[PDB]
Amino acid sequence: IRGDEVRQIAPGQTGKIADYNYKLPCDFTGCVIAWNSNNLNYN
Amino acid sequence: WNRKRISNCVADYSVLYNSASFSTFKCYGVSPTKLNDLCFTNVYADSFV
């Protein structure tokens, strides 16, 4: 995803990514790991 | 800060939310998606920089 949308990947978040692409449940037991990959673009 | 009152009209909040020009859209007490399902007694729009 984009850098500014990294906060949208979290339980109880609102946004285009959260609602249309990837919805985490409210009682999400897990971990979220994000690293800046500016090495690997319209694909 | 310039306070402009909005009342007695039909408000479309989805066009503001889906617009990408806005950096932060933080809603306290309401969720932006549900904003079109609600009816408000009064609206105040306070603008500044």
| Resolution to 1 decimal place, in Å | 3.1
Residue of chain A minimizing CA distance to B32: A14
List residues in chain A touching B: CB distance below 8 A.
Answer: 14, 19
> In chain B, what residues touch A19 (CB-CB under 8 Å)?
33
Query: B2 by DSSP, 3-state: which?
Result: strand
Give the technique used to solve this structure. Answer: cryo-EM
> In chain B, what residues touch A13 (CB-CB under 8 Å)?
none
Q: What is the distance in angstroms between the Cα of A43 and the nearest Cα belonging to chain B?
A: 21
- Going B41 to A15 to B26 to A10, the CA torsion angle's sign is positive
Tokens of A18: 């959260």
Q: What is the distance in angstroms between the Cα of B2 and the nearest Cα belonging to chain A?
A: 28
Q: How does strand B43-47 pair with strand B2-6?
A: antiparallel
Distance set, CA B18 to CA A19, A43, B15, B24, B33 (Å)? 12, 23, 5, 12, 10
Backbone phi, psi, residue B17, to 5°: -70, -45
Are B24 and A7 in contact, with CB atoms under 8 Å apart?
Answer: no
